[PDB]
Design a protein around this ligand. Sequence first.
Ligand code: CLA
Ligand code: CLA
Ligand code: CLA
Ligand code: CLA
Ligand SMILES: CC(C)=CCC/C(C)=C/CC/C(C)=C/CC/C(C)=C/CC/C(C)=C/CC/C(C)=C/CC/C(C)=C/CC/C(C)=C/CC/C(C)=C/CC1=CC(=O)C(C)=C(C)C1=O
Ligand SMILES: CCCCCCCCCCCCCCCC(=O)OC[C@H](CO[C@@H]1O[C@H](CS(=O)(=O)O)[C@@H](O)[C@H](O)[C@H]1O)OC(=O)CCCCCCCCCCCCCCC
Ligand SMILES: CCCCCCCCCCCCCCCC(=O)OC[C@H](COP(=O)(O)OC[C@@H](O)CO)OC(=O)CCCCCCCCCCCCCCC
Ligand code: HEC
Ligand SMILES: CCCCCCCCCCCCO[C@@H]1O[C@H](CO)[C@@H](O[C@H]2O[C@H](CO)[C@@H](O)[C@H](O)[C@H]2O)[C@H](O)[C@H]1O
Ligand SMILES: CCCCCCCCCCCCO[C@@H]1O[C@H](CO)[C@@H](O[C@H]2O[C@H](CO)[C@@H](O)[C@H](O)[C@H]2O)[C@H](O)[C@H]1O
Ligand SMILES: CCCCCCCS[C@@H]1O[C@H](CO)[C@@H](O)[C@H](O)[C@H]1O
Ligand SMILES: CCCCCCCS[C@@H]1O[C@H](CO)[C@@H](O)[C@H](O)[C@H]1O
Ligand code: OEX
Ligand SMILES: [Ca+2]
Ligand SMILES: [Cl-]
Ligand SMILES: [Cl-]
Lengths: 37, 30, 34, 34, 37, 51, 342, 137, 243, 51, 97
Amino acid sequence: METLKITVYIVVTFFVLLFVFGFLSGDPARNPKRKDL
Amino acid sequence: METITYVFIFACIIALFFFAIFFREPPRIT
Amino acid sequence: MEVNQLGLIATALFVLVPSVFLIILYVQTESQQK
Amino acid sequence: MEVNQLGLIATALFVLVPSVFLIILYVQTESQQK
Amino acid sequence: MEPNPNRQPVELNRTSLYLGLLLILVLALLFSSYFFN
Amino acid sequence: EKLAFYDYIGNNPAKGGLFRTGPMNKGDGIAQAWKGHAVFRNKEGEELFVR
Amino acid sequence: TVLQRREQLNLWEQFCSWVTSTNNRLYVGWFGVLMIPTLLAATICFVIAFIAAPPVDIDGIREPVSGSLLYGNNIITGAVVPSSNAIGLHFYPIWEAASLDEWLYNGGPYQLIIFHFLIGVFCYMGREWELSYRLGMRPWICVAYSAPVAAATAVFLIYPIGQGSFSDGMPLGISGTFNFMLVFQAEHNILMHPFHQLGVAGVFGGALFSAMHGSLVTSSLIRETTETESANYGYKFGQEEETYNIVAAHGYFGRLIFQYASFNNSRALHFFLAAWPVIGIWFTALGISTMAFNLNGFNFNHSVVDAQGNVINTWADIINRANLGMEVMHERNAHNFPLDLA
Amino acid sequence: AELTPEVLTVPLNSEGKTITLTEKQYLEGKRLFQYACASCHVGGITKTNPSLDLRTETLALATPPRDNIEGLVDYMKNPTTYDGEQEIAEVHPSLRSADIFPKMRNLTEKDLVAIAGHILVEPKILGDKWGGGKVYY
Amino acid sequence: TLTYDDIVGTGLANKCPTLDDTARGAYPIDSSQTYRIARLCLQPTTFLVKEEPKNKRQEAEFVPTKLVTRETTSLDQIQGELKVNSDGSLTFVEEDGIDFQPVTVQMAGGERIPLLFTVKNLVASTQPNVTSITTSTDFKGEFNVPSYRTANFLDPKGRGLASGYDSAIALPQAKEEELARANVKRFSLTKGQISLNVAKVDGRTGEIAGTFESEQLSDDDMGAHEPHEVKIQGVFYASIEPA
Amino acid sequence: LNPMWRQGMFVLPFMARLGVTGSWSGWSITGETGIDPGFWSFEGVALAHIV
Amino acid sequence: ELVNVVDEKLGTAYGEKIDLNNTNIAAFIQYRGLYPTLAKLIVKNAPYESVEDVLNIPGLTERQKQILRENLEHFTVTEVETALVEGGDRYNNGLYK
Ligand code: CLA
Ligand code: CLA
Ligand code: CLA
Ligand code: CLA
Ligand SMILES: CC(C)=CCC/C(C)=C/CC/C(C)=C/CC/C(C)=C/CC/C(C)=C/CC/C(C)=C/CC/C(C)=C/CC/C(C)=C/CC/C(C)=C/CC1=CC(=O)C(C)=C(C)C1=O
Ligand SMILES: CCCCCCCCCCCCCCCC(=O)OC[C@H](CO[C@@H]1O[C@H](CS(=O)(=O)O)[C@@H](O)[C@H](O)[C@H]1O)OC(=O)CCCCCCCCCCCCCCC
Ligand SMILES: CCCCCCCCCCCCCCCC(=O)OC[C@H](COP(=O)(O)OC[C@@H](O)CO)OC(=O)CCCCCCCCCCCCCCC
Ligand code: HEC
Ligand SMILES: CCCCCCCCCCCCO[C@@H]1O[C@H](CO)[C@@H](O[C@H]2O[C@H](CO)[C@@H](O)[C@H](O)[C@H]2O)[C@H](O)[C@H]1O
Ligand SMILES: CCCCCCCCCCCCO[C@@H]1O[C@H](CO)[C@@H](O[C@H]2O[C@H](CO)[C@@H](O)[C@H](O)[C@H]2O)[C@H](O)[C@H]1O
Ligand SMILES: CCCCCCCS[C@@H]1O[C@H](CO)[C@@H](O)[C@H](O)[C@H]1O
Ligand SMILES: CCCCCCCS[C@@H]1O[C@H](CO)[C@@H](O)[C@H](O)[C@H]1O
Ligand code: OEX
Ligand SMILES: [Ca+2]
Ligand SMILES: [Cl-]
Ligand SMILES: [Cl-]
């Protein structure tokens, strides 16, 4: 159960970090019109 | 036999989802 | 569980007969001259 | 008579599945251009 | 996608339909007694 | 009892039928217990054996 | 270490470009990065539990309720059963149980499913915003979808929180849904609550307006086909011209009622089609979410009294008799004291 | 049906003397009963002890008898258990414990008489519904 | 030393107090003075259930089980008279306490066995001539095992003993004799047995601790099916005081 | 007296032949209780084949 | 055969009077002077071989004994029924209004 807990914690942290750094990576500029936001 | 029947129908529905999305008639502008 | 003994064939034919009707119509549409 | 309770659906699908296969194939042959 | 050159049309003429339905129905008439047992 | 149960023709695989479907338990039943070894004797007390 | 950071940085940018690509068959996006694993986890656990989970002690009284198909249910009676009342609002992941057998007895699957499901649909809502931004659309489809999201959140999260137990969240099943509705009426008189009445106007009206709009556009399609063709072939995907005569449609509807009851402005009309059901569902979601804190439907029990002081019953009092029947019977082994206070 | 002087005539004491309440008295008693008592005694039951109700037949068998104005007024000053053996002002609102049950403060003799009259009149109007609980709703 | 907030959520609240390894003393008994057990605690560590074989001659064994109702199993705050008998033996007479817990354990293969783990109305006695309680003192006794559900409990079709329907109302014209065992609820009352093996004694404080083994029947679902035989092993703690 | 071959089991003996003998529910085909098969129980084998 | 023991008890004096060995304590409210003081003493000191044994409860006052004698006509005794006395049901049997 301990191994499963640590595994899930890592898995969740992984996806949440992708989400956060993803939206930090100049997301306003990812659109078809004014890409200089 | 009942459980098999319910799960069979469900599984056919999931398969249908797959074909309806990935093997749809492609929308085409003419 | 003591289910109706005809429930299985009722459900199978309910699925099979109209599905087959549609499949017949679809395939013979695809095979028509395009 | 105390017959096998799956005998009915076994016989029904034995007839229907290959018969439907043949009907699908026949009808889509007829609908091909002549 | 570019079309697959190996496709071929399939046919079942009417006589073959009748022959096949006869085979299936007679096989059913034969084996059904054993399915009911 | 496991050894006695092997010495019983209902577990012989050459006793079935092509359309006798399902588990062996559907035929003779679900085996519960060995009844014990039957010894037959006549009125003179000679031991007799069933063919 | 030197330019290696730039080989890592462009690789990150390639990943960002793929995640946010307008050319994936299914849009991924940053919301999709959270949505995809949580919906898959919830779906997989739900399917396995619906087929095979053993009975669950929903009300914490060692009285396990069977929800799965293999344990004697059909499609209509089956459910994934809410977690035990002994757990209450405590967080009960797999690793808090001594065993999977314990986790199953106590309704662990329910919590795993609803929490992943709710993350998933909140991210599905964010994803609807995100793709509209990538496509150069206006942004508010996600606002319409916030109505079903609010409603799901009310029955799986807000109501359990107010009542102090996920054992009172809506079960994941067809008959379990009806059980939730009946007990809700007994304990909150939701039928007499104006937010549920708005909900009904929202869905009755949405269905009415769907049929109305559908019939009026269909009624005024321009002839582009013969009688042996489906009229649907008279429209070609992406054509510039409108496919029906909205002047004809308005001329019909304006005479059906009167001229000024009919929309001639297609944008006003389609805003109305959006707003009516969406607002109705917002209010009914708020109904569940505020009856979660026991501000309940109107209570006119014994409101009408004659000159001597005898109660003169109204239809509200007959409703009360039905509510009492459900109240006294529900969870027949769970109450030891005279008031059902949650 | 009407709220008549006969309906409003209730036993004053255990010796058979009656009193005829005014319609104003009854309505004040009903208002005061809601103000200080209905949180536990709505409809003549007792939420924190459902074994004891406010039916006249029950009050008649209490010790001392509570099926009359003076008995009920005495109860609101110095409540006892059903057998009269223990004084329960520490856990039941009364004039004696108005310091800890502040809604009893400023209640006059007339107020207690009105509350008592309401309790005796209400079953004459409602019958078994008074003290009946949800079965009778 | 520990407070509720130190303990809450840890599982320690389901554990009985323990004694140090140094507690191997002797608690003197004065035959002229009366005694009581001020607190008896029983913490089960193993639930075994006797298998029910098909062969009526294969000796059945107690097999291990999985607890599925979490850390809700211990008996505690039990008190009663500790009598000094003519022969110097002691007899504990249980008077009150949290002396039962419903418990569900699961056999291999999934079968759930609910039981009312209990020492209700325990009377347990030592050997004679117990002039002091030592790590050689033992208690043996019997207790009552009442029905796992009490008389108001209603089955899923609303049938019960002191309440509920008395028939299968969803089968209005079915024959009733075949459903009698499900329709007519019965209230079980059986006997259990327990042994307490004292392993530690604090002679100064009157505290003792050790292991127990108890045997009793499981839930019979108000007569609907045969109960199973259960063996419970665990640890115990007791504080003795003059009364 | 009720082993797999009396019960019409066809793939169970093939899993057992190569060392899969326990269920996640705690039993083993040799009659043990409280065994831990790890992932590779009969159920884990079945799941692996579905995936 | 199989018998519901509570329904059976309704055919005895338990169904007609307050059974000092079985009836739930709220029934003592039916008569003057019995609840709660005597009712508690009666339930605690049960069972009784005959109704008159209720007069021998240790510690009764002289007035309490007089009150009990006045109410013996409303009492009965039958054999203790486990289903009615387990669960603390004589003190709270799950019935309110
Ligand atoms: C190698 C193949 C194989 C074998 C040896 C087994 C063996 C077994 N199966 Mg499994 N099974 C299999 C494949 C197999 N199965 C497949 C592919 C499926 C999916 C359909 C199943 C689904 C299945 C189920 C649901 C069950 C079994 C059960 C069993 C047991 C009973 C078998 C029985 O009664 O058969 C009966 C065999 C027959 C009646 C023979 C049929 C002969 C056909 C009809 C002849 C057709 C002739 C044809 C039409 C001629 C055309 C002529 C034309 C060319 C001119 C036995 C251990 C049973 C069991 O006990 O489970 C615990 C059981 O309930 N099996
Ligand atoms: C998007 C991926 C994702 C997310 C968000 C979750 C979320 C959850 N999982 Mg699931 N899971 C996933 C994928 C995910 N899972 C996958 C791929 C698997 C298969 C390996 C699982 C297998 C699994 C199991 C078997 C179980 C869970 C459980 C849970 C719940 C507890 C998790 C926890 O304690 O984390 C620990 C918390 C952290 C690690 C926090 C670190 C993250 C950052 C630093 C902080 C985030 C929180 C904060 C509010 C910031 C939010 C930012 C926001 C703007 C995005 C939670 C609902 C449990 C459950 O459902 O309980 C009922 C459970 O038993 N998961
Ligand atoms: C003729 C039958 C009839 C009528 C007139 C109504 C009418 C109503 N129902 Mg009921 N209902 C019915 C049958 C009917 N119902 C049946 C058979 C069932 C199932 C048994 C229900 C179940 C039901 C539920 C559960 C609820 C209602 C509710 C309502 C109210 C809102 C309905 C709504 O928005 O629909 C959608 C229709 C529209 C959005 C179009 C507008 C409709 C309005 C009412 C017409 C206005 C006319 C106007 C005042 C006239 C002026 C003329 C002008 C030219 C001067 C409305 C009073 C709700 C309620 O009670 O709220 C208080 C509610 O919660 N209905
Ligand atoms: C004619 C009578 C009538 C009518 C018209 C209604 C109508 C309604 N009731 Mg009321 N009710 C009634 C009688 C009625 N009721 C009676 C008699 C009782 C007492 C027995 C009740 C007690 C009651 C309760 C307790 C509740 C309702 C609620 C509702 C609303 C339910 C629909 C909804 O919330 O959509 C909103 C949309 C959703 C809930 C969908 C969420 C979708 C999520 C986000 C995604 C799901 C994806 C899915 C899993 C997979 C999709 C497929 C896949 C292939 C992609 C609707 C307004 C519910 C409500 O107000 O909820 C807020 C509610 O909780 N009613
Ligand atoms: C025997 C005797 C005496 C006989 C005499 C008979 C006689 C001659 C009488 C004449 C005198 C006379 C008429 C007297 C009248 C008496 C009288 C008042 C009777 C009462 C009748 C009455 C109350 C009727 C009520 C009708 C009623 C409630 C109407 C409400 C209308 C209503 C709620 C409308 C909803 C408003 C709204 C915005 C709806 C939009 C819905 C929708 C989706 C539209 C979609 C849509 C709209 C478009 O617009 C176009 C374009 C397209 C594309 C499209 O999608
Ligand atoms: C017991 C648990 C077991 C679970 C195990 C699950 C693990 C799966 C691993 C295998 C993955 C392969 C599958 C790919 C299928 C696919 O979508 O391709 C379709 C395209 C093709 O990929 C495209 O592929 C192209 C290259 S090529 O086609 O591969 O050559 C490439 O050009 C393009 O960028 C790329 O997008 O992929 C995409 O459009 C982008 C990713 C799609 C995101 C998937 C969404 C899943 C949501 C689930 C929500 C709940 C579902 C329940 C509802 C019933
Ligand atoms: C698990 C799911 C499995 C699903 C399987 C579904 C499909 C299986 C069924 C296939 C059936 C095929 C039948 C084809 C039938 C058919 O097409 O025949 C005619 C066919 C003629 O073929 P030709 O080469 O002339 O091509 C014409 C084309 O149009 C055919 O596609 O010959 C054959 O197919 C050879 C086999 C002949 C068999 C003939 C037997 C007829 C005799 C009647 C016997 C009964 C009476 C006996 C009296 C005693
Ligand atoms: C809840 C907190 C209560 C409020 C507020 C009031 N009463 Fe009460 N009442 C309550 C209890 C628990 C009991 C039973 C006490 C016991 O142990 O005997 C009672 C009893 C009475 C009675 C006696 C009823 C009988 O049949 O003998 C009377 C007459 C009574 N209560 C009147 C009363 C009035 C007038 C109140 C408002 C001023 C009132 N009660 C408040 C609980 C509570
Ligand atoms: C729980 C986690 C907490 C994290 C807290 C973060 C604190 C702030 C640290 C910011 C780190 C992210 O730093 C951010 O990364 C991405 C990729 O590397 C950079 O680069 C991004 O922006 C540029 C400019 O729009 C885009 O052209 C480019 O496509 C994109 O990759 C951002 O310009 C930088 O600002
Ligand atoms: C439960 C029982 C289920 C049994 C199901 C059996 C399904 C069998 C499916 C048969 C599929 C036939 O596949 C079909 O072949 C025909 C030719 O034969 C193709 O048709 C193609 O050839 C023809 C003839 O030259 C052209 O006129 C046509 O324009 C061209 O598309 C179809 O594009 C294809 O859809
Ligand atoms: C994809 C695998 C699905 C897991 C199947 C359910 C868990 S495993 C399942 O549990 C049952 C009850 O304990 C047992 O009776 C049975 O023998 C066992 O196979
Ligand atoms: C698809 C879900 C996969 C779940 C994985 C659970 C691993 S479980 C783990 O596995 C080991 C290897 O078999 C065993 O030795 C060990 O005893 C067991 O606990
Ligand atoms: O859990 Mn489901 O239900 Ca909400 O109230 Mn209280 O708790 Mn139970 O009773 Mn009524
Ligand atoms: Ca020892
Ligand atoms: Cl319920
Ligand atoms: Cl309660």
